[PDB]
C-alpha cells in the first residue's frame, strides 16, 4: 500500500508460504537451540516475547 521497496511490513504474519507451513518457535526455545544456522536456512516465526 505504501510503495516501499522490499517492504518489511505484512498485513498479517503468514501461516503458510507457497503452500508450506512456517515454523513457529518460542523465544525461550530459540535461546537454547544449537543448530540456528541450519534453522535459519528456512524461515521461522518467533513469538512469546516483546
Amino acid at each position: 500500500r505504501f510503495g516501499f521497496r522490499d517492504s518489511p511490513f505484512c498485513t498479517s504474519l503468514p501461516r503458510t508460504i507457497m503452500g508450506n507451513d512456517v515454523r513457529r518457535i518460542s523465544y525461550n526455545v530459540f535461546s537454547m537451540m544449537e543448530d540456528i544456522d541450519d534453522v535459519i536456512s528456512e524461515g521461522f516465526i518467533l513469538y512469546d516475547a516483546y
Binding site: S26, V29, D48
Partner: protein
Amino acid sequence: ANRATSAFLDNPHPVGVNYVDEGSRQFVAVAELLASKLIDSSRESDESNSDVPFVQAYSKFADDNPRHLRVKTGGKMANALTNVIRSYYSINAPAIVPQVEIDRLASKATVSGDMYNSYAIFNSVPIVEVLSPARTTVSIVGSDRADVTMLNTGAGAANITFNFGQIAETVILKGSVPFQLARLNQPMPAARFTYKLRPLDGPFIVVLPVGNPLVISATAATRIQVPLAFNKALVESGFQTAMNDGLFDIQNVNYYSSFDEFIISQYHAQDGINRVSTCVILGLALQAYDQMRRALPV
C-alpha cells in the same frame, strides 16, 4: 487326540508398518531421553525450592513455556508420541503424524536411535501344543509360569507330547511329584523333580502314570535385542497405562496381560522376526509414555 495351547499365543494380530525408519526411531529415543529429564527435573525442583528446573525441562519437551492458567498437556511431542504408539499396535491404525514433525522433534537431542545394542530376557512360557491321547485331560493355565495339569483316567500309562517351539532358549520343568521325561526315540530316565530342556532339541514325551494328577510348572527365558535405554519395569508400567488410556482400542486386535506376553506371541508367529523389531520400538515408546505421564498427569 486332544490339543492344548497357551491362550496368549493364539492369533497374534499384525503390527504397524509405519514409523520404523531411522529418523522415526531417533524420535522415539529422543522422547525417552527428554521424558526422563522431566522426571529428574521434577525431583530436582522439589529440593531446590524453585520451579525453574522443571520449567526448562518442560519447555524443551513441549516447545512452549508453562503457564499457570493453562493445562500442561505435554505439547506437540506428547501428541506425536501418542499417535505413533497407536500406529505400532495395529496395521489398521492410521498414521496421522507427518514426517516433517517427526524430523523436527528428533533434532532436540543427539541420540543414535539404534535398537540392537543390548539384550533383554523375557519370561513368557511358550507352549505351542500339548498332544494327549484319549482318556486323558490336559489343562494349561498361566503365562509367566505355566501349570499343566494332566489326569489319566484309563488303565495304562499315557504318553504326552510337549512342544515348546523353537524360539525360547531354556525351559525349566518342575513337577508336583517326580516324573519321567525324554525326547523322541530316547530311553526314559529315572523319575525326578526337575528337568532342564532346550526347545530346539525336539518334542518331549512325559510318561503319565495312572492315579493322582500330575502338575508340571514351566518357566522359560528368551533373549531379544533391545536398546541400551530399555528398562523392563518402565515398559511394563507404560503398557498398562496405554491400555487403560485406550491407545490400544481398535477393531480386530488381540489384547495381552503384559508386554512380555505381547512380544513373545508376535515372535512365535510367522514373519515374527520382522515383528519383534517393531515391537521393541513400541516398548521404548511405552517407556517414554510412562515417564511423561507420571510427570504430567492428565
